[PDB]
Amino acid sequence: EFLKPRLVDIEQVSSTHAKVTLEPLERGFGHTLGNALRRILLSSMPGCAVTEVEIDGVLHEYSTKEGVQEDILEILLNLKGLAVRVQGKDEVILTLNKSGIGPVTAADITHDGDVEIVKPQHVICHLTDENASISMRIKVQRGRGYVPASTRIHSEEDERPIGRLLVDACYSPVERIAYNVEAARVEQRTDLDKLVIEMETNGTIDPEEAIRRAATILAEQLEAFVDLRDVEFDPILLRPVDDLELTVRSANCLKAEAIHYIGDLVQRTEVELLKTPNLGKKSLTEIKDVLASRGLSLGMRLENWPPA
């Protein structure tokens, strides 16, 4: 008995601006859907952003290159705003080389297989003499949210050679999104509601695909509601007892006392095992001696003892 919204009359204003219309809506559902979609789109949207770069002659971000008009730190900031669209891959490498006089933009990036630069006038550096050159290799990745360069550590599992520059990643193609609620033009129904979602991205995502992604994210999140219901670690320990090359006399004594594991012996303080029959003062020293060789002195205290 609830009308279902249909994504109709989608119109595009510019290469970034976009308006998506949801014609049939009920009384109060317009604001609910608009807020949910806006939060989903602003929070978690897939996108591509530059992860790390490699310039030929630089060593770190706080240096300069002869012949260029900008610092390497500045160049990283102009690169951070570069937006790309990759198809079928996630670790695309964007190598660019340029020589001469004038600004160097994304239009001169080498033409890879399937990578679309949304805007080709995005300047990243300027050249100031005829004979200087700039050769850099840019790596772009795909992500979901804001990932600072400092926070990530898994990228350091393999050592990064001196010269690899780390740049923060944003991964969010949606920069601004606002919704509006009006009255639908349907007159046969008494009063109906329509929703228009003005969305401003960097051109990396399709507005209809963005709305679809938000809707499926919301549906998968809500899937958990439609069915509520619901109404001794060290390797040195846990070892066989007959591994400490003890004497014959201690072997039978331990069996009678039932010390079948190493950790059971280490928990016995010196004042109590001496009461065991035929333990032996010199033999007791032998047990202490071999256990001191492993670094396991008598008198420790454990908490939990699994049978195995």
Binding site: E66, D71, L77
Partner: protein, 248 residues
């Protein structure tokens, strides 16, 4: 530690340390200087008859206690006469209203009382005196960020603070710039003014990332791109917390 009424145009009444050293450490006002003997003066404009002239006379603390000194925020006419017959003034440490013919001296500008640190606060008059003190002291502690960002609302005194601090690189005799680098700027001086013999060009060696006393970084980034004409006193490289020669 009190503000004597002769601290008008020579010592700032706002900028000063707060807890222990209040009233013992001061800051010279914008237009103040020292005497040939070592006394602080303050500019004033001579007023003859009812029209204030543009001639400027420098008055020490002792001398200013005899004349009658007008107010900077007093209206004027096209020729120079005061717009009212009654004008607020300062005679000897106090303030009253005097006749237009009794006025003897005129305040040069509304920035005379304050110092450099308190001059960069917009709507200073709308702020409490102690809160203005705290803001003026806190301005001297901001760290220069990664990118300079001009103030959308300022007091026009940012340029004077940035240019005369020595942080920026000012073209001493530059003409048309010849080659701009991320660390070097070279300008070919225009022919109208040259030193005869050996010709020559002016070369600037910008200082890149360098530790400062408070462990902060000092950076200089060029402004001019290429072939841009540059006049005397023009700013080419803006230092830390400076955008196009504007303190930011």
């Amino acid at each position: 530690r009190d503000v004597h009424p002769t601290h008008y145009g020579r010592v700032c009444p706002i900028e000063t340390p707060e807890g222990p050293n209040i009233g013992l450490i001061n800051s010279l006002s914008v237009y103040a200087q020292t005497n040939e003997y070592g006394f602080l003066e303050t500019p004033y404009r001579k007023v003859t008859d009812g029209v204030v002239t543009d001639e400027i006379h420098y008055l020490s603390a002792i001398e200013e206690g005899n004349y009658v000194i007008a107010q900077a925020n007093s209206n004027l006419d096209e020729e120079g006469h005061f717009v009212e017959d009654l004008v607020t003034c300062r005679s000897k440490g106090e303030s009253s209203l005097f006749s237009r013919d009794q006025v003897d001296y005129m305040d040069v500008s509304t920035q005379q009382v304050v110092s450099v640190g308190a001059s960069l606060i917009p709507f200073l008059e709308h702020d409490d005196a102690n809160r203005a003190l705290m803001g003026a002291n806190m301005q001297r502690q901001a760290v220069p960020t990664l990118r300079a960002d001009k103030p959308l609302v300022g007091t026009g005194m940012e340029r004077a603070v940035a240019v005369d601090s020595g942080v920026t690189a000012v073209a001493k005799r530059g003409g048309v710039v010849q080659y701009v680098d991320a660390s070097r700027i070279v300008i070919k001086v225009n022919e109208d003014e040259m030193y005869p013999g050996e010709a020559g060009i002016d070369i600037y060696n910008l200082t890149k990332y360098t530790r400062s006393n408070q462990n902060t970084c000092i950076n200089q980034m060029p402004c001019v791109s290429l072939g841009e004409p540059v006049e005397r006193g023009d700013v080419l490289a803006d230092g830390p917390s400076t955008d196009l020669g504007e303190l930011a």
